[PDB]
Design a protein around this ligand. Structure first.
Ligand SMILES: Nc1nc2c(ncn2[C@@H]2O[C@H](COP(=O)(O)OP(=O)(O)OP(=O)(O)O)[C@@H](O)[C@H]2O)c(=O)[nH]1
Ligand SMILES: Nc1nc2c(ncn2[C@@H]2O[C@H](COP(=O)(O)OP(=O)(O)O)[C@@H](O)[C@H]2O)c(=O)[nH]1
Ligand SMILES: [Mg+2]
Lengths: 431, 431, 48
């Protein structure tokens, strides 16, 4: 019944996957061994003959290091060994190695495992793909896998949780190349993609959680909370839900304009105790503050095409409507002329769950806003400009060419990005 | 990506290589018998990058020791850690190269090369995933220089897809008496431009100047110079042998450091500057370590970094220090010294911190710079070469081995092209 | 989807066309910068 397969690619994807599955277990009361003393959680966890609950997920990396940590870690019994796939040689921060050279060896094995998970599904909805834009596996392997998934799965829904690179936490000089190459190749294969800017997350951890030097552990816990908010509607049956298809129907007006901006609130430090409890009005107001965004950009300089508000916990519709009405009086929120109905609201009964010993405080109510704004084009522009700086001099291009890539593939990828930026510009013009 | 195969060639190569192995063995808590006696799990985490595990608790360097002359090898075996090396891995001739590149590259060297490749093949076929090779040698001699570059070419033929790394010691009038060093160096530089992926340009001119001027050692010995070499080699390899995020393998390092194929000559730097045994009881804070990156006094290549621009920089901080302080100090240096970093390679300075400091120091900093100022080292070699070549002085030693004048003209022209290439990117703009 | 499968099996064969042919050059250099060695070991026993 309505199953969703989660695919975690590369270090970023695997590590975020660890955070997500840890959170899902806390939310559904599943122990790290798969034991548990609703029923919608079955969309994400299958059940064995021994009454154990197993994530409907595949973890893939071209190097074994990251996944070896999962198979030694606290949740080693949660996953069956065959769903944790690793190669020997990494993609060395090279898209060409991830997509071609190294990727081509493991691709068939990964798809065989995905097929085995799909065979356990009676009503497979589709896939959730987690990966970084910057790493060679995250970029190269993901686009290779996305292409193969479109072939094998017909028109089955594919949603992405993409880690947009940040210099505070960047590991490679070539991350703009990998980012543009993966976006170009995956664009025609993805139905909806949620970008997560590592700088936005780094800044929220620093500002809201008072973490001097945020680590991936800090970043991922916060990311996991946003992913859980988006997936709560699939894993629980509330008063107001949204399936794989309804997300896309409400937020995606055109094929290529499939990049919603996520904004989460509240993000409170596990100290204090007085900084709560925030009302529905307070958390809703926080969604329109650029400081709570998952991607750095300015919505006040763009136009909205769709706004989805996903509430969780002690929330009443009357409280929500009152909050939306006051926000509507703040003229500053501009929508495109061809869009009338702006606000689609969902309420899921379960309050946000936090990791014990984590940085996040336990709150009675939280909210995740998914908005399709033309302001997200600013994130593409930043990436495109960094690509252009290096590409004008063909800096580092030889690393890709040597792996069998052609220079024409770079031109093609960049021209497609120029067309995407042009699309966001054309969409914001009135008739 | 896991194992690195180390090769030591010639007098200098074996001397520096033997010191590298006693330095890293001490850092990894390995005694001269091969037994681990340390007290930190970090020491063993990536032990497999440089050591093979022999039956039981013993660790053996994956090192091949080469010379056309037997004496140096005997001195290594007699040494402190001499017993640690694999008996079968010593490959020595009887006939010597007599500080003649032609004898090492074409005559005597060619006769021994196959016996060396037989030992490198044994080590390579034992590997789960060979990253590539690391060669230590001098460019002023005959074996290290001529045979060393011959080995590079023969290894490259059999392992064309592996990373080729070298630690090449450049000759100086200040420290050696073979009069033909400019010819041996130029003939070797021609080979390295074409055959390696990364070369650490270790300059005896800079090492002598540090010993004499900074360490106030009136008459420096090779032991004094080698203490600076081994400190640098330990620093630049930190990322490869301890668990880390940045430049964790030879390929990732190359991909982040090399923008253009031929511009793969690194200028290493080290702080603080130490003499054999000189404590290190109170010295060096984070701002102090960071400031010595632009300090020409701390460069292992006799070039002023302020006479050029950095294409890419890797900075490795070692010891117990604040990651926040490191990040602040590193950003301050890039902002203050904007003009010494190329604008067309975004986020080109990458930093890593390792908790384990090198021996005798509680805090250290290693710098790996890909600077256009390295042209000063090549210019020095070209002018010394031309002063001799103009008069065809000592050419009989090379022509007598079967060499032709054209090879000399070609090696020189190739090296001048390399200088011209550095100058081109020094003058390039982000227009 | 019919036409999709092929675009990919083309990509992985114009790449594999190249990746092979950049190790074609890798070796042809490496064989010539060896042909010269004999042409030079030549001049050594020929040295009279
Ligand atoms: N949020 C987050 N970002 C991460 C994490 N790990 C890596 N990243 C980011 O992803 C990029 C680096 O790519 P990786 O995922 O580490 O690399 P990879 O996919 O394993 O690919 P290769 O190592 O090259 O084979 C950088 O922008 C990092 O900041 C993580 O756990 N969380
Ligand atoms: N730093 C350093 N340089 C050395 C050492 N031994 C020789 N050299 C230098 O290496 C060059 C001579 O080459 P050498 O290695 O002795 O000859 P080979 O055995 O034929 O390679 C000159 O530039 C010397 O100054 C040493 O132990 N340390
Ligand atoms: Mg990785």
């Amino acid at each position: 019944m309505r199953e969703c397969i989660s695919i975690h690619v590369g270090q970023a994807g695997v590590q975020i996957g660890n955070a997500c599955w840890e959170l899902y277990c806390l939310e559904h009361g599943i122990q790290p061994d798969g034991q548990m003393p609703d029923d919608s959680f079955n969309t994400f966890f299958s059940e064995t003959g021994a009454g154990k609950h197993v994530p409907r997920a595949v973890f893939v990396d071209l190097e074994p290091t990251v996944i070896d940590e999962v198979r030694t870690g606290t949740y080693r019994q949660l996953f069956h060994p065959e769903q944790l796939i690793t190669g020997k040689e990494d993609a060395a921060n090279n898209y060409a190695r991830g997509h071609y050279t190294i990727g081509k060896e493991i691709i068939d094995l990964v798809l065989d495992r995905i097929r085995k998970l799909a065979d356990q599904c009676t009503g497979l909805q589709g896939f959730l793909v987690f990966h970084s834009f910057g790493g060679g596996t995250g970029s190269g392997f993901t686009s290779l896998l996305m292409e193969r998934l479109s072939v094998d799965y017909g028109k089955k829904s594919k949603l992405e949780f993409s880690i947009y690179p940040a210099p505070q936490v960047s590991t490679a000089v070539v991350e703009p190349y990998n980012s543009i190459l993966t976006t170009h190749t995956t664009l025609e294969h993805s139905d909806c993609a949620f970008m997560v800017d590592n700088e936005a997350i780094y800044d929220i951890c620093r500002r809201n959680l008072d973490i001097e030097r945020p680590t991936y552990t800090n970043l991922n816990r916060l990311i996991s909370q946003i992913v859980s908010s988006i997936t709560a509607s699939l894993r629980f049956d509330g008063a107001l839900n949204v399936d794989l298809t309804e997300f896309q129907t409400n937020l995606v007006p055109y094929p290529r304009i499939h990049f919603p901006l996520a904004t989460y609130a509240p993000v409170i430090s596990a100290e204090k105790a007085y900084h709560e409890q925030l009302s529905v009005a307070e958390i809703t107001n926080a969604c329109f503050e650029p400081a709570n965004q998952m991607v750095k950009c300015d919505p006040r300089h763009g136009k909205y095409m769709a706004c989805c508000l996903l509430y969780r916990g002690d929330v009443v519709p009357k409280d929500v409507n009152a909050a939306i009405a006051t926000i509507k009086t703040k003229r500053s929120i501009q929508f495109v002329d061809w869009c009338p109905t702006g606000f689609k609201v969902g309420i899921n009964y379960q309050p946000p769950t936090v990791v014990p010993g984590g940085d996040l405080a336990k709150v009675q109510r939280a909210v995740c806003m998914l908005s399709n704004t033309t302001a997200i084009a600013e994130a593409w522009a930043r990436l495109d400009h960094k690509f252009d700086l290096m590409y004008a001099k063909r800096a580092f291009v030889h690393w890709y060419v040597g792996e069998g890539m052609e220079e024409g593939e770079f031109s093609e990828a960049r021209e497609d990005m120029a067309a995407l930026e042009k699309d966001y510009e054309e969409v914001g013009v009135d008739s | 990506m896991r194992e690195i195969v180390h090769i030591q060639a010639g007098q200098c190569g074996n001397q520096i290589g033997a010191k590298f192995w006693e330095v890293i063995s001490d850092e990894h808590g390995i005694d001269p018998t091969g037994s681990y006696h340390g007290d930190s799990d970090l020491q063993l985490e990536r032990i497999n990058v440089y050591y093979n595990e022999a039956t039981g608790n013993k660790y053996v360097p994956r090192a091949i020791l080469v010379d056309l002359e037997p004496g140096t090898m005997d001195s290594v075996r007699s040494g402190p850690f001499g017993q640690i090396f694999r008996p079968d891995n010593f490959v020595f001739g009887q006939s010597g190269a007599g500080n003649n590149w032609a004898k090492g590259h074409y005559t005597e060297g060619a006769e021994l090369v196959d016996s060396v490749l037989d030992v490198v093949r044994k080590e390579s076929e034992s590997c789960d995933c060979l990253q590539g090779f690391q060669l230590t040698h001098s460019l002023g001699g005959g074996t290290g220089s001529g045979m060393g570059t011959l080995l590079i070419s023969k290894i490259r033929e059999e392992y064309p897809d592996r990373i080729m790394n070298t630690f090449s010691v450049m000759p100086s009038p200040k420290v050696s008496d073979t009069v033909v060093e400019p010819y041996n160096a130029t003939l070797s530089v021609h080979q390295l431009v074409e055959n390696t992926d990364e070369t650490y340009s270790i300059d005896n001119e800079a090492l002598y100047d540090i010993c004499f001027r900074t360490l106030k050692l009136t008459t420096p010995t090779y032991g004094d110079l080698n203490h600076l070499v081994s400190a640098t080699m330990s620093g630049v390899t930190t990322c490869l042998r301890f668990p880390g995020q940045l430049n964790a393998d030879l390929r990732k390092l190359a991909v982040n450091m090399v923008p253009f194929p031929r511009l793969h000559f690194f200028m290493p730097g080290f702080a603080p500057l130490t003499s054999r045994g000189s404590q290190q009881y109170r010295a060096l804070t984070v701002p102090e370590l960071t400031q010595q990156m632009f300090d020409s006094k701390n460069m292992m290549a006799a070039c002023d970094p302020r006479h050029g621009r950095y294409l890419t920089v890797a900075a490795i901080f070692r010891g117990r220090m604040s990651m926040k302080e490191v990040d602040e100090q590193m950003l301050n240096v890039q902002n203050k010294n904007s003009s010494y970093f190329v604008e067309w390679i975004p986020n080109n300075v990458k930093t890593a911190v390792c908790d384990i400091p090198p021996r005798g120091l509680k805090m250290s900093a290693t710098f790996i710079g890909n600077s256009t100022a390295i042209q000063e080292l090549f210019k020095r070699i070209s002018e010394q070469f031309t002063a001799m070549f103009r008069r065809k002085a000592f050419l009989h030693w090379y022509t007598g081995e079967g060499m032709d004048e054209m090879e000399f003209t070609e090696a020189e022209s190739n090296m001048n092209d390399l200088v011209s290439e550095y100058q081109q990117y020094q003058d390039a703009t982000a227009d | 989807i019919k036409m999709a499968k092929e675009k990919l099996a083309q990509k992985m064969e114009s790449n594999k066309e190249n990746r092979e042919a950049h190790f074609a050059a890798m070796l042809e250099r490496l064989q010539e910068k060896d042909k010269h060695a004999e042409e030079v070991r030549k001049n050594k026993e020929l040295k009279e």
